[model samples]
Target: MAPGQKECDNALRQLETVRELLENPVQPINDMSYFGCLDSVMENSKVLGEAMTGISQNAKNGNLPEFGDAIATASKALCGFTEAAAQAAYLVGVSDPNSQAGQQGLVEPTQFARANQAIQMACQSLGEPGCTQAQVLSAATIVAKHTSALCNSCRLASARTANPTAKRQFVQSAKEVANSTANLVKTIKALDGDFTEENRAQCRAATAPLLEAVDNLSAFASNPEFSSVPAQISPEGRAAMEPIVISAKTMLESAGGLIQTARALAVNPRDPPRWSVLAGHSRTVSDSIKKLITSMRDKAPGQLECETAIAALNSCLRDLDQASLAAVSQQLAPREGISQEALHTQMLTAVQEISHLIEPLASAARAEASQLGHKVSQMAQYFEPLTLAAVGAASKTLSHPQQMALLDQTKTLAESALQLLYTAKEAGGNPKQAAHTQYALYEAVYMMTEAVEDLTTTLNEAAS
Candidate 1:
């Protein structure tokens, strides 16, 4: 016989888990310790996810009415670990790089938002169609966490290099990001307590780290410390990038505002008039970002720099355009009587489009930050560009079977270069002491190979 109290009792047990965690917190350790914590969080999150699906069926499972208080609290407890686990990963490097190979140090925001917004969906369930303050608070933690890592990764690169000026600038950016995100987390925590229709605070909270990023990344771009792989542009072209940088910074800040407004409209769909006002504002911001991107492309030095940052900006625009479609769909849903599944899909889709841009945008802006990280010995120096070229070539041509066959037949110089790198490593190489010698070539090889895998993984993810 099904028990009416099944979900009610489940909620109480879940609340107990939170109580135990707070009472006896697991200390985040170094390296793989971070990795293991992430695994644990994922497992707990899965259980929470299962709970979301069975929300309305509690009575059929036998609703335990006596435990309603505990049920709501426990349901709201969903996805609390995502922010905490991600924090540990970024503050200290996660162990088992091999396990997460080709992964950047950064945590993408989509992972956080989906887990959070879903759990929040369970919090209100079919009882309400809109999201909660708690979900945004949960979602905001991820932005803080991700933005904080930009500082962390920058400082690591700065620490690795001997350049005092670069170190000072990078460290400054790190400190600013750290301090700002601390405030960001605090504000978001405060916000999780209530559902406000107004979004002024949300707009403020969302744009703080974004503006900071533009400043720091802009500084990094102004005077690139690592000249090893210079921006592939003529001096005229490179200098022209300064104006575009200014415009891009303004555009990004505008988009941050647009994100908050879109989220607001998503929740506040009853007010269709406010919808057109904010929606128009968002269109203006996106169009501005697009203009800046096009001008930057006209001055693109070469493929590498263009492919990285410019391509990333283009994706950001795509996200906004899609989000606009979602807002209008929701606004019209009243007449059309949109399905709950459809509303959530369109809603999160818009939210995801914003979340999607954060990683790539940051990566493109800070790509040059790593230029100074390597202290290449002569051999490592020779092999760095060689391996990068090989990585690029392999990505373009040798991703699949017929191409793999072609690669076997061609017997290119990259293959010969790989053999040489191997021979050099096996021998008592490094005639001169190279910076990070023991690790350099090994990493160089893996990253390029890993790039191939990352490409494959992305294709799979998109298809799924």
Candidate 2:
């Protein structure tokens, strides 16, 4: 049958069932004989793979029909399965004993209710001259298909299991699956070419699934069954998970980088290419941050070490924000707009601004280091009592990277400032002095550039 005819048939059947249920108010069958939705989905997926194989075979022989048929069949099956599953799910919900009083029936829930109403309204207009069954089916299919796999899973699992423990497990698993599916759907919906209004709406929609998934996963993890499962995790477990956490942190840092770049490009207008890079970078950063935050929020903390790490992270973020703003004003703002003479003046100003900024950052770092020093000292003392060398070593290195990066940035800025002062005097002085000053200025510029580059590289590496 044609796609249109099949949809129409499905729609008519759905509407007829709704009408019959409404008129009779009878209880539908609540049996959970596995129709193999998951297995069928898997089987159909394999069939799709097989179809691809056939397409390749046909293409080699210069025969298109086999490939075409395979594509059509796959497409049709996907649509059919989606529709059939949706309808089955709705029926299951209405018939299921688990649903609340008003919520129990298929047509009672918010989405399905809205869909049924829309279809019923459409059916009422079907008697009109231009009204077609295909239109009715198309309209009705939207609601039916909106029925999620999770919802179906819930109903099926409820019906399938007679044992309470098994049923609870199945329900939990189904919820997780549903949450994951919803997040995927939302993410796909959110994607756009650029961050336009349409795209933003899509992103918001996509975020819903992830948010829901997080909630479900958190609940699942807290379940007694999961917590009671005593599995031995190796040191490799930490090694495996660290990269994921690092990747997430990197993504968040990248977001800030993107915004900074965008602001720079907007102000400078000299480098449009930077704007594209900024956008691409920001998107990656956003995705990474989202995943990281989700994982951290959902996952259970294993040790006090985890808490200490989180606290240090908070301190770093606070310091970085302050440092970043100061750096921008001192380093970036002056270089915004102008030609040679103006550029020279701006460079001098940039040097002064950088000096002012770095001073505070250095102070902040020292303060943070001192605070962390106390914690580390205490940890060292605590470990010394137990004679734990590894714990002491890890504690010592905890604050090392931050201290190093901050010092490097400060040294570079100070050097740049000295050079800028000399260069400014040279620009206003005689040719001989200017030549000497230019050499000093060149060295200063190189140092400043190296410092900024190092900071950036470190930030990138740390985040990853």
Candidate 3:
């Protein structure tokens, strides 16, 4: 029972709970808040489902570490949904002891307590009984306590508006429920055993900022003042989410690469004295990657500079890894360092030579593009088959005006693809030329497959 197994279990439970609540409309009073909670819960389940799928697939593909990442993603989604549901329940007084909706929502208190218990059991089952369970428990306990207190307040307010006898009864009942929930939460928190300080710190640092950001976004999204704002209805909020998504992707890629590299380096017969040197080199590569990402982030929208920056960063890492491999080989046999050293020197020279040639190569590609345009004009070639194929597909079944517009867009995209190919070719052949050529070809095939898939989808849609 790794994290993936835990998430699969949790997601299944959550999905069940949401289904139950949605199927049986909570007692009396239903409102927007209730619907909103249901919607959020459903969306969370979808996210968790996607995460679980990814994790399971990765595990099937023998990528256990990625499974861990997927589980973490599922956990975050669950926490987010639970928090939203609790807030919605509080806002609508669904959890108030005096309300009919409260009786319906009251089922949630026991469920929430059980979920906390389940998470703890998951950690134990995963064989890390003393893992980051304490931090999770603490966070969950805080949320539960606040939810219970809010529920009590709701009941008190409801009581003040009702009869005195009922008021006393409801208030007392609410207090008892609150106390029970809080005690349960605290008990779970206390069950958490000691874990590594470093692991705990890292988890806290990563999750705290993310949680705060989500909280801020949630608050803004729910605010009535912002509800009527056109910007709220527009894609601006979704657009804002892109940077966070991209940052996460970038961080994951870099971290995963470094971990792989470290594992490789650990078993290599490198000089003990050179370990520090290797570490410094690794840090330099990491810094370069960070700088590349920063540059990409600062680029103008739609500039597409990020791809080139990433290519350059990757080239650097490829070269560094090759050099390290050569060093490892030397350490393995105590061979003449001169031959390896000379080869390293030659590699550096080749890299510098390629760097110097890129500008001229780019000029040549522009010239080639010009020549191709002239050739096309002279032959009046009905655009290449691929270009025609793209346009024909776009134009099929479209109105005349729409067809022309699509034709123009397809032509532009085709031309852009050609230009990108030319630019990539001009980028000085690959740093680890032979090895990277294979990788590039593999990636190109994947891209082609994706393009074909898109075309197939479009064709099927047209037929439909």
Q: List the residue pairs that clash in candidate 1.
A: 3-62, 4-62, 4-63, 5-62, 31-95, 32-95, 232-301, 233-301
Residue 152 in model 3: shift from native, Å?
Answer: 3.7
- What is the C-alpha local distance difference test score of each model? 0.37, 0.38, 0.38
Q: Model 3: per-residue lDDT, tens digit, 43-71?
A: 66567557646543564455555555565
TM-scores of the candidates are 0.27, 0.19, 0.27
Error of 3 at 20 (Å): 1.2
Query: What's the count of clashing pairs in each model shown?
Result: 8, 5, 0
**Pairs of residues at least 3 apart in sequence or in different chains that clash in candidate 2:** 94-106, 183-209, 186-206, 190-202, 190-203
Candidate 3 displacement at residue 35 in angstroms: 10
RMSD of each: 25.8, 25.5, 25.4
Q: 188-242, model 1: which lDDT tens digit per residue? A: 4554445454443454544446455535554453343442221123344323434
